[PDB]
Design a protein around this nucleic acid. Structure first.
Lengths: 106, 97, 95, 82, 98, 82, 97, 109
DNA sequence: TCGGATGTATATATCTGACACGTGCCTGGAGACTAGGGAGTAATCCCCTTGGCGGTTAAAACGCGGGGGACAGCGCGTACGTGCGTTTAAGCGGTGCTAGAGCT
DNA sequence: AGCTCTAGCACCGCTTAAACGCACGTACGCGCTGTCCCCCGCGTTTTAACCGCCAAGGGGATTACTCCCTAGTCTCCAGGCACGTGTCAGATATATACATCCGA
C-alpha cells in the first residue's frame, strides 16, 4: 500500500506537484524533500485564510458562493492580505465602498 | 417639479459604482482603442477576447486607483473638484511621470 | 500538454474544510488558482535567491521558512511558519 | 486602419470610473487628461504584450501575454490564468 | 543694526549648498546607534559591518530626501510654502506606503 | 541599553535633508513625523537584513544583507557590491 | 592565508572608459557603482530571459530571448541601440571560427 | 592546437563572453545557454556601460575633473531621460540629487 | 420644521445554467535502490567589530525678534451638476469564414 | 514540416438604453482680505560627534573530513483530470419597506 506524501503531512495540496514544479521551475540545482512539504503547507494555509475571509464576506452578503467581489472585499479588508496583495489587481473585484467625509453633505 | 441638488445624485452614483463589479467602459469602444494602439507595433494583430478584457480590467482598475489618489490630493488642496494638476501630481508622486 | 493542472480540486477541498456549505464560482476559482501559483512563484523565487546568496545548491525548509518570513507580513508569516513547521514535523515524524 | 478611437471612450465612462474612485465633482478638463493618461498606460502594456507575442512568433495576443506585461510592470492581474 | 538676510534667503542658500554637495547629512554615530537600537529589537547581540551601517544610511537619506521632494510638491500643490505633516502623510499615501 | 536614539537624529539633520529635498520652509511638526517615517523605513529594511543574516546563521550584518534587503524592498542601492 | 579571488567588471569598464574618454579616469567608488550597475542590468536581462524561455517552456536561452528581454527592459532608444549592438556583435561573431 | 582566441575578441567586444556565459550557466537561468546568448548579452552590457561612462565623462569635464566620481554618475543617470527611467528605482551611493529648485520657491519682484 | 417624493433595500416566487457530483482511466506520484558530493562538522586563524580613552571643535541646542504666510473669512461667478429630448451605436443574436494556434 | 479544426474576424439585423446636446441653476473655485503666529535668521551656549589610538576576542573565512542526503532510474497503480450530468443558488421578476433628501 502506497500512502501519498500529502496524506502523510495531513495536507490537501499535492506535495508531489509542488516538488515537480520546484524541480521543473529550475529554482535551484537541488530540492530537499522537506521544501515541497513546507511550501505546500504554507500555500494551503494561505489558501484557507483567503477562502475563510471570503466565505465570511459571502455570509455577510447572504451569499453561499464565493465570487470575485467577496475575494476583493476579503483581501482589501484584511490588514495583512492587503499588504501581501497591494500590487495585485483582482478581475471583477471592483473596489471597497468608501466615500470621504469631506464629500458627504453637512 | 422635484429636483436633486448638485452632488446629491453624485453621492448616489458613487455608492452605485462602488457597489457594482461590472466594467464601466463600453467593451467595443475599448476594444477599438486597443486595436488602434496595437496596430502601431504590428499590423493585423489578433487579440483573444480574454486579452481585451484583461486590458480593460487592468485599465479600469488603474484609472480607478488613480482617481482615488487624484481625489486625495484634490482634498489636500481643500477642493472637491478634481483638476488635471491633481492627476499630474498623483502621477508624479506615484513615480510614473 | 492538453491536460491542464490547476489547484481547483485542492482549493475546493480546503473550501469544504473551511465552509462545507459554501461554494465558489469558476471565476473566483480562477483567481484563487492564479493567486496560489503567484504566491508559489514568489516563495520559490525568493528561495532561489537565498540559496544563491549563500552559494547553496538545494532548497530546504530553511530557505522556504526564510522566504516566508521575508514575503509574508508578520502574523501571516508566524502562522504560516507554524503551519509549515507542523506539516514538516508530522511528515518527518510519520516517516 | 482604426484611428481616433480614444474619443470613443465616452464622457460618462470616465465619470463612472471617477465615481467608483470616489470623485464627487469632475472638472471639464479631466476627460482629456484621463484619455491621455489611459493612452500612455495602454501603450506601455500593449507594447510589452506585443513583444511577448512577437517573441513567441505568434500573431494573436494571448491573455497570458497581457498578464505577463502587467506582471513585468508590477501590476499583476489575477483571474486570467496562472 | 546688524545685517540680516530675509526669511527664506538663507534657506535658498542652504538648498543650493546641500544640493550641490554629496555629503551625508545625518551623523554616523546617532544613526549607527539608531540602527543597533532597531536591530537589537529584532535579534540580540547582533554585529554590524561598518559598511552595512553606511549602506543603511545612504538608503535612509536618499529615501527621506526623495520623500521631501514629493512632500514639497504636495505642499506646493496646496499653494503652501511650509510643508506640513499632512503633506508627508499624503505623499506616503499616494506612494502606496500606507 | 540603547534607547531613544531616534530623538538623537537632530532637528538640523532633518532640516538639511529637507533642504536638499528643496524644501524652503519646514513646519516644526515635520521633525516628529519624519522620525516616525524614518523609523518604519529602517525597521522594514533591518528586519529583512537581519532575516538574511539569520538564514545564513551569521551574527554580523554584512553590506550584502543590507543590499539584498533593499533590493527585495524594491529600492536598489548601487555601490556596495552585488 | 591569502584572499580568494573575487571577480569584478572593473577592467572591462576601464577599457570601455579608455575608449569613450581616453583622458578620463574613474575612482574606485565610481567603479564599484559601475560594477553594481553592470551586475544589476545583467541580472535583470537574465531574469527576464529566464521568464521568456519558461513562458514558452524552452530549455535553452538564445539570442532571441536576450533580444526580447532587452526590448522589454530597456527604454525605446536604448533598446534600439542595444538590439543593434547585440545583433552586430552576434552576427559578426558568427562569422568567426 | 589552434591559437586560443577569446570569444570576446572574436565578437569585437571588451566584456568577457566567457564570463557572461559561465554566469548564465552557474546562475541556472535555464537548462541550456545558446552560444549566441552570452555574445548578445555581453554586447548589451558593454553598450550600456559606454552610454553611462560617456555621459559621466562629459559631466566630469563639465565639472573640470578628470576622474569620474559618484556625483558625475548620478548627474549622468539623472540628466538622461532614458537612463533615469531605467534606473528610476535605483539609488546611487553618495550621488546626491539633481540641483533643481521649484520656481515657485524662488523670490519674486 | 416636515411631509411628500422616491430611490434603495428586502422579502417572496419561478427559473435556469452553472457547479456540484459522478465516472473512466492513465500518468505521474510512491516505493524502492543506487551513487556521490553537498552540506555538516571540527579545527584553525585572524581581522574587524565592539569597546574604551582623550579632546576638541564643529554642530546642536537654546532664545529671541519679527515677518510672512497659514488660512479664516469674504465675495462672486461660472463652471459643473441635473434634467430633458434626442439619437446614437453598443450589445446581442446569428451567420461565414478561415487564419493560425495547437499538436504531431 | 504538416495537419487540424479552433475561435478570431467580419457582417447583418434588431433592440434599447447609454451617449449625447442643450437648458439652466447654484455649488463651489478662488481672488481678495485680514491677522497672528510660528517659522526663520542670528547669537549664544554647550555637548557629544568626531578623530585617533589601543584591546581583544569572536566570528567569519578557510581547510579537512565525513556521511547521509538527493538525483536517476525503475516499477507500479490509482489519483486526478475531461467527459458526463443534473439540480438547485442566485438571476430575474414582483411586491413593498423605509431613509433620506427637497421644496415650502
Amino acid at each position: 500500500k502506497a500512502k501519498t506524501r500529502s496524506s502523510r503531512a495531513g495536507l490537501q495540496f499535492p506535495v508531489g506537484r509542488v516538488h515537480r514544479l520546484l524541480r521543473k521551475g529550475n529554482y535551484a540545482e537541488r530540492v530537499g524533500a522537506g521544501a515541497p512539504v513546507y511550501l505546500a503547507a504554507v500555500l494551503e494555509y494561505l489558501t484557507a485564510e483567503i477562502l475563510e475571509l471570503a466565505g465570511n464576506a459571502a455570509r455577510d452578503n447572504k451569499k453561499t458562493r464565493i465570487i470575485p467581489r467577496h475575494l476583493q472585499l476579503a483581501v482589501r479588508n484584511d490588514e495583512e492580505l492587503n499588504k501581501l496583495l497591494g500590487r495585485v489587481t483582482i478581475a471583477q473585484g471592483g473596489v471597497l465602498p468608501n466615500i470621504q467625509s469631506v464629500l458627504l453633505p453637512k | 417639479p422635484h429636483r436633486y441638488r448638485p452632488g446629491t445624485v453624485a453621492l448616489r452614483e458613487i455608492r452605485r459604482y462602488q457597489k457594482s463589479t461590472e466594467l464601466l467602459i463600453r467593451k467595443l469602444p475599448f476594444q477599438r482603442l486597443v486595436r488602434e494602439i496595437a496596430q502601431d507595433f504590428k499590423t493585423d494583430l489578433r487579440f483573444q477576447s480574454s486579452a481585451v478584457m484583461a486590458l480593460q480590467e487592468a485599465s479600469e482598475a488603474y484609472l480607478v486607483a488613480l482617481f482615488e489618489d487624484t481625489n486625495l490630493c484634490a482634498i489636500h488642496a481643500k477642493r472637491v473638484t478634481i483638476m488635471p494638476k491633481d492627476i499630474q501630481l498623483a502621477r508624479r508622486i506615484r513615480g510614473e511621470r | 500538454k492538453s491536460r491542464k493542472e490547476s489547484y481547483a480540486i485542492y482549493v475546493y477541498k480546503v473550501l469544504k474544510q473551511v465552509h462545507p456549505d459554501t461554494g465558489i464560482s469558476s471565476k473566483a476559482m480562477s483567481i484563487m488558482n492564479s493567486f496560489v501559483n503567484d504566491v508559489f512563484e514568489r516563495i520559490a523565487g525568493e528561495a532561489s535567491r537565498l540559496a544563491h546568496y549563500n552559494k547553496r545548491s538545494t532548497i530546504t525548509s530553511r530557505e522556504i521558512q526564510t522566504a516566508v518570513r521575508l514575503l509574508l507580513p508578520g502574523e501571516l508569516a508566524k502562522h504560516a511558519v507554524s503551519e509549515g513547521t507542523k506539516a514538516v514535523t508530522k511528515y518527518t515524524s510519520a516517516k | 486602419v482604426l484611428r481616433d478611437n480614444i474619443q470613443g471612450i465616452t464622457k460618462p465612462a470616465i465619470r463612472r470610473l471617477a465615481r467608483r474612485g470616489g470623485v464627487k465633482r469632475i472638472s471639464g478638463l479631466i476627460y482629456e487628461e484621463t484619455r491621455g493618461v489611459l493612452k500612455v498606460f495602454l501603450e506601455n502594456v500593449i507594447r510589452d504584450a506585443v513583444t511577448y507575442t512577437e517573441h513567441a512568433k505568434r500573431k494573436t495576443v494571448t491573455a497570458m501575454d497581457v498578464v505577463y506585461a502587467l506582471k513585468r510592470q508590477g501590476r499583476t492581474l489575477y483571474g486570467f490564468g496562472g
